[PDB]
């Protein structure tokens, strides 16, 4: 599966698709979200009637904030990957001013919104999503892709109630070690903060942060400013709510492990240590991949150089 997935990945990655649509083929409806270099819009392909999410990026602004590489690299990964929990990129093109990424529209909205509304997810509800992230990271890691931006804000929920990862702005194809200071403060692994040369194990730490936030309603380390959050992460002092099961605490103690020589996902058994853990015993791993498990929640948006692209 992973070998065929790598073979499928490599072909597309080595020969990327360019200019597969035009801006005049879409009716712009509403803004769904906003970023550093532009916005994401609900859009309608006029010659089929199909809806899509259009990510518009200002070239001048991308050059301005020196994010050329990370921008070229995101479209390149998006057009080369294929997994049920990763948004499908339908088209990509550019004009005089902008770069466009047209993806499948995910009407369910961000996990973030649902999580802040409900307050917290039950452990069965938190596990269903955790399992999807475990399989997604196993797929990405086998392709040498480090994700580096896991958070409920980057996880969209579809009609079937399954996750769709949309943002690959900090993803990097690297076999070994990398150094960039990037990600979101609450989700930064201690090795990223402590400015070490880090690896894929940062994504497994971010999984611990996510599992904790989904099950409690708040992240394991927060404070008014990033700097104070950084201190709590490097200390590795983690308090758990009394409703957390014994199994949840144990998985988290192993995921939120400062010593990456002991961190689950980074040991010789790799991902199998997470998959075989007690907290995941009722998880039908193949059924989740096959989206045959019934979602515990079925659904949502707020109101608002480049040659190889």
């Amino acid at each position: 599966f992973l070998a065929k997935a790598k073979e499928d990945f490599l072909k597309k990655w080595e020969n990327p698709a360019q200019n597969t649509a035009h801006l005049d083929q879409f009716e712009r409806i509403k803004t769904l979200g906003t970023g550093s270099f532009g916005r994401v819009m609900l859009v309608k392909h006029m010659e089929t009637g199909n809806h899509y999410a259009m990510k518009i990026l200002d070239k001048q602004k991308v050059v301005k904030l020196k994010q050329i590489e990370h921008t070229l690299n995101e479209k390149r990964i998006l057009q080369a990957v294929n997994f049920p929990f990763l948004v499908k990129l339908e088209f990509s093109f550019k004009d005089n001013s902008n770069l466009y990424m047209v993806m499948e529209y995910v009407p369910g909205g961000e996990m973030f919104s649902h999580l802040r509304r409900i307050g917290r997810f039950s452990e069965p509800h938190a596990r269903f999503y955790a399992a999807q992230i475990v399989l997604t990271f196993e797929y990405l890691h086998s392709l040498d892709l480090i994700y580096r931006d896991l958070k409920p804000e980057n996880l969209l929920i579809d009609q079937q109630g399954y996750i769709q990862v949309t943002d690959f702005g900090f993803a990097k194809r690297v076999k070994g070690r990398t150094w960039t200071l990037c990600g979101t403060p609450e989700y930064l692994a201690p090795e990223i903060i402590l400015s070490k040369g880090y690896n894929k194990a940062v994504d497994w730490w971010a999984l611990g942060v996510l599992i904790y936030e989904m099950a409690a309603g708040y992240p394991p380390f927060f404070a008014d400013q990033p700097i104070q959050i950084y201190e709590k992460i490097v200390s590795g002092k983690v308090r758990f709510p009394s409703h957390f099961s014994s199994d949840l605490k144990d998985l988290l103690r192993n995921l939120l492990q400062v010593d990456l020589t002991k961190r689950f996902g980074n040991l010789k058994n790799g991902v199998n240590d997470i998959k075989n853990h007690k907290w995941f015993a009722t998880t039908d791993w193949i059924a989740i991949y096959q989206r045959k498990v019934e979602a515990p929640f079925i659904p949502n948006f707020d109101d608002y150089e480049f040659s190889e692209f």
Binding site: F112, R116, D149, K151, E153, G169, F170, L181, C182, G183, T184, P185, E186, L188, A216, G217, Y218, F222, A223, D224, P226, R239, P241
Partner: peptide, 18 residues
Amino acid sequence: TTYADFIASGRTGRRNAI
């Protein structure tokens, strides 16, 4: 409580990357 402390921190909204 930890829940009140989380609210006390103005970090309950959507977080941007660094």
